[model samples]
Target: NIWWQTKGQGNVHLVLLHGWGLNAEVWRCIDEELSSHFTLHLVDLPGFGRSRGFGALSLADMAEAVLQQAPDKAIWLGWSLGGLVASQIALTHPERVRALVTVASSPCFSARDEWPGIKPDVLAGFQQQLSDDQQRTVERFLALQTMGTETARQDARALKKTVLALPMPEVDVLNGGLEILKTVDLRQPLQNVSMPFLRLYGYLDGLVPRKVVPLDKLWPHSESYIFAKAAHAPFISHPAEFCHLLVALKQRVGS
Candidate 1:
């Protein structure tokens, strides 16, 4: 079963999914703020954190697992790789999602000839390093995710600390997530998502560069915001501003 935690009290439910290589604890920094405004359902995607035992899971499988334990319907907020899963759920199970928020994430993670994203070679390097040393590779990735931020060092340290606090992810699960990042592309289907969609980005993010993907042009109906001073984890670096935007999104959709 997928492991999840619920906090606060409200009619509005918000499901929070963490990015790859990290777990639910990554949301701790902004938990209180979010929980105060809405019921927060924070989940550890299958094969990560407390939800373990799954192996070589696909993005679809991960999304299904979360849905099994998810509220009947809720607003979903996903960061990085988690955003991909959330987008899949939105596309496949529109009834389950009231709105969608993608944080520092892209529909296509790796760059194609015409896409703007992380270089395929860069993703391959992490995959290769993971085969050699899973722990080291994850640590290195945490650094990369925080790269290009003013507080890169501090953010890296925090990410490392939180990720290490949980059991190491299974090797197959890590590879599966990397594979998903390497292959999954949701740009076309995203245009069909009926729910209110919000895309959040970090202007200084190294992994999900804001300039690469033209979110506005791709999904004309969706809204987007960028945190100028943050990297991969804007909520961690700018919790107040992040929470404010989230609250605004909730109100906008609620209306």
Candidate 2:
């Protein structure tokens, strides 16, 4: 089950999904900016926020739960973990997704032999950290969120507060999530997703760095925007630009 916020004065539906350890509220600033052009739906994935269950759900299962509650066919805007889940939805149920907008997210989140995915050592470190201390793990993750520049640091702190306001998940659940991050690769599944897509990437994001995939070669029809100064939370860091791009998408869909 998931809890979502729905608003706006338009017919075009836009579903917003937050990253791991965070809830739907993280998108509030962008949500306010988007309401006039889209009916925004911000959701808390299973085991996070007001949603139920944890450490026991797969990405596919989490996608299914969100699908059950989503509009029959809606444009999806997912951030990080939310992006992974949205990608799964576009792959497994393409017809249900009118289009896709993935923010600071990667298809194959973890690094592979041919893919310059997330560093193996960092993945291992996060796994161990989560097991040892969850609060500290989240804090460490928070630091990584804005590791690149001065602007990125400011963005990280703002986003950290948003996550902190949400209901914290159990350490075991966080551990399981880290395990998924280590093992789950959505590369094959991403190839099957046919919706018109747009990928928003932060060049400085350590977790889902831009080097992992040649997104243009992989999904040629999909448009992409790279933010040199941004990190993991682009919406928080560049809300105006982000909202502008999304509004344009809504207009395109409506036309």
Winning candidate number (TM-score) = 1
Off by over 4 Å in 2: none
Model 2 clashing-pair count: 1
lDDT of 2 by residue, 167-203 (tens): 6887766766666667778766566566678899887
> What would the TM-scores of all predictions be?
0.97, 0.93
Clashes of each: 0, 1
Candidate 2 lDDT trough over 10 residues, lowest sum: 186-195
TM-score of 1: 0.97
What does candidate 2 score on TM? Answer: 0.93
Q: After superposition, how far is residue 51 of candidate 1 from its true place, in Å?
A: 0.9
